[PDB]
Amino acid sequence: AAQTNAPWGLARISSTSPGTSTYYYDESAGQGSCVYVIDTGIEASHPEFEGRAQMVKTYYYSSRDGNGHGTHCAGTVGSRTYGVAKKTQLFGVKVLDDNGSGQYSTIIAGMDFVASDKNNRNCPKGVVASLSLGGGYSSSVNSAAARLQSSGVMVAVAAGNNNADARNYSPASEPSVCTVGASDRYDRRSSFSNYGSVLDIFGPGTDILSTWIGGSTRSISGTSMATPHVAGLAAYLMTLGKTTAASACRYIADTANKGDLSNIPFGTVNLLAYNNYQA
């Protein structure tokens, strides 16, 4: 399948080179997988989700995304137009309030909640979680990420937005999950991407067009926008039979475009998420 004049990040993760705008992909498009977006929620009523998105948990007084962040992430995972895995089932877990912020203990609560709930959902092809959030190192936050991963969920986490080595940030530093940095449409590391040997992979994160609340769209930027490109991609790869929730971060690294980002500080991977469809 091909989708012309695509947001640029969807073309990138289907390209070897930058500078094009079609998204080439297999039509199975993540059918039969599932992705949890653990964030401010998901405006599931956005027609771009076409009935495939459900809130299923909140730790606040409403499950609605009243911020838009969670809705934008989720759109990149699996909206019809702006998504990677255009036919995956989405699930929302509102651990962030509406300004964006969340205490660690609630973020922990929502992470253990996915390891349990996946057992209440129909995900024959695999299950993913997408965490576009974080804050300073915590053993506990990190441990809640290893559990979620260990429970057979592919966990994708934002490396962080300070340009700082991410080993000081959680859940990014947690080694057993898949820590994602951001790039730009000219293959530069985005100016705000954390970096450091705990990263596994980069995806698109600078000027990422996706859904927003009010039925709407916007382009915003972050390792947060990069993260749901890897999550959606892993859903897409499960479904295709290429990899498994426990093997997907290694498979994506193995199949990445290798060398191609400029400003990888020394010691940081220079691997860019690629779908290995058109070549």
The binding site comprises 16, 175, 177, 200, 260
Binding mask 207-226 for Ca ion (x = CB under 5 A): --------------------
Active site residue 140: no
Least CB distance to Ca ion at residue 249 (A): 4
Tokens standing for 277?
């469809």
Nearer to Ca ion, 153 or 209 (CB): 153
Least CB distance to Ca ion at residue 155 (A): 9
Nearer to Ca ion, 83 or 160 (CB): 160
Helix (H) or strand (E) holding 128: strand 126-131
Alpha-helical runs (H) found in 118-185: 139-150
Active site residue 46: no
Total binding residues toward Ca ion, as defined by CB under 5 A: 2
172 binds Ca ion (CB under 5 A): no
One-character DSSP codes across 18-67: SS---EE--TTTTTTEEEEEEES---TT-GGGTT-EEEEEESSS----SS
Contacts of 30 (CB under 8 A, 6+ apart): 78, 84, 85, 86, 87, 88, 125, 232, 235, 236, 238, 239
Contact 257, 217 (CB under 8 A): no
148 binds Ca ion (CB under 5 A): no
Catalytic residue chosen out of the listed positions 15, 39, 46, 132: 39
249 binds Ca ion (CB under 5 A): yes
Least CB distance to Ca ion at residue 28 (A): 25
Active-site annotation, residues = 39, 69, 224
